[PDB]
């Protein structure tokens, strides 16, 4: 580092996406049958208002490679004021139904993994003088272990039906089939994923980007979300 020259923090935060629902319908034909704002309730559980979108991206650059981390943060965890007996478990308010949750319907969501750490070391290239490609690859990780280790044995008193049989006498390899044999029980999955876009900025400080949030490539495109939130991103460096 002979010289300082313009190396070190930067922050970005992504956005754009776009939608055209029956936000505003256009009656009139069917004559008005809608009520003066027609408070939603069953229709829709809630949905905007709650948990918005803040997902934040920060780093530091360095000609060349470029390390980002995203925090999300929130995990149905409500700490509030150190204090007890805050809200009052009892109201006068009859109404309340906690869970809205339907049976013979089982409504898709995310469970899989809420709230975590996630790190990727995307690469800002000097080759060009005014706009740098943008290429890299995530790694994400999440509070799935607690405990450092379990035991040395591996024993356990129940006996796992998985795979009794051992051909103690005569007869071997009677079962060809493959076995996955799950040990642990972690619903926690891993996850891994590309970033890539294009920066174009008047000056390090000023650059507007194509973003685009992509998953691994595994077994076919089985993925659930797609871009989920990317498509156009501005960040500010010095």
Request: charged residues 30%; hydrophobic residues 25%; glycine residues 2%.
């Given at each position: 580092a002979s010289e300082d020259g313009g190396r070190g923090p930067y922050v970005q935060a992504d956005l754009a996406y776009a939608y055209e629902h029956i936000t505003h319908d256009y009656p009139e034909p069917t004559a008005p049958n809608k009520?003066?704002?027609?408070?939603?309730s069953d229709y829709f559980r809630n949905i905007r208002?709650?948990?918005?979108?803040?997902?934040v991206s920060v780093g530091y650059d360095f000609g060349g490679w470029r390390i980002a981390a995203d925090y999300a943060r929130?995990?149905?965890?409500?700490?509030?004021?150190?204090?007890?007996?805050?809200?009052?478990?009892?109201?006068?308010?009859?109404?309340?139904?906690?869970i809205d949750r339907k049976t013979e319907n089982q409504e898709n969501g995310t469970f899989?993994?809420?709230?975590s750490l996630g790190l990727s070391a995307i690469y800002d290239f000097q080759i060009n003088d005014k706009f740098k490609p943008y290429i890299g690859a995530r790694v994400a990780y999440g509070h799935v272990r607690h405990s450092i280790d379990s035991t040395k044995k591996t024993i356990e008193v129940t006996t796992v039906p998985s795979n009794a049989p051992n051909g103690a006498v005569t007869t071997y390899n009677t079962d060809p089939k493959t076995q996955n044999d799950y040990q642990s029980n972690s619903i926690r999955r891993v996850g891994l994923g590309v970033i890539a876009g294009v920066g174009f900025d008047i000056t390090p400080k000023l650059t507007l980007d194509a973003g685009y949030r992509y998953h691994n490539w595994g077994?076919?495109?089985?993925?659930?979300?797609?871009?989920?939130e990317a498509s156009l991103g501005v960040r500010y460096r010095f």
């Open positions: 009520n003066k704002i027609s408070t939603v208002t709650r948990s918005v979108h803040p997902r929130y995990r149905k965890w409500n700490n509030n004021k150190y204090s007890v007996n805050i809200e009052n478990v009892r109201i006068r308010k009859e109404n309340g139904i906690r899989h993994a809420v709230s077994r076919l495109e089985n993925t659930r979300f797609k871009t989920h």
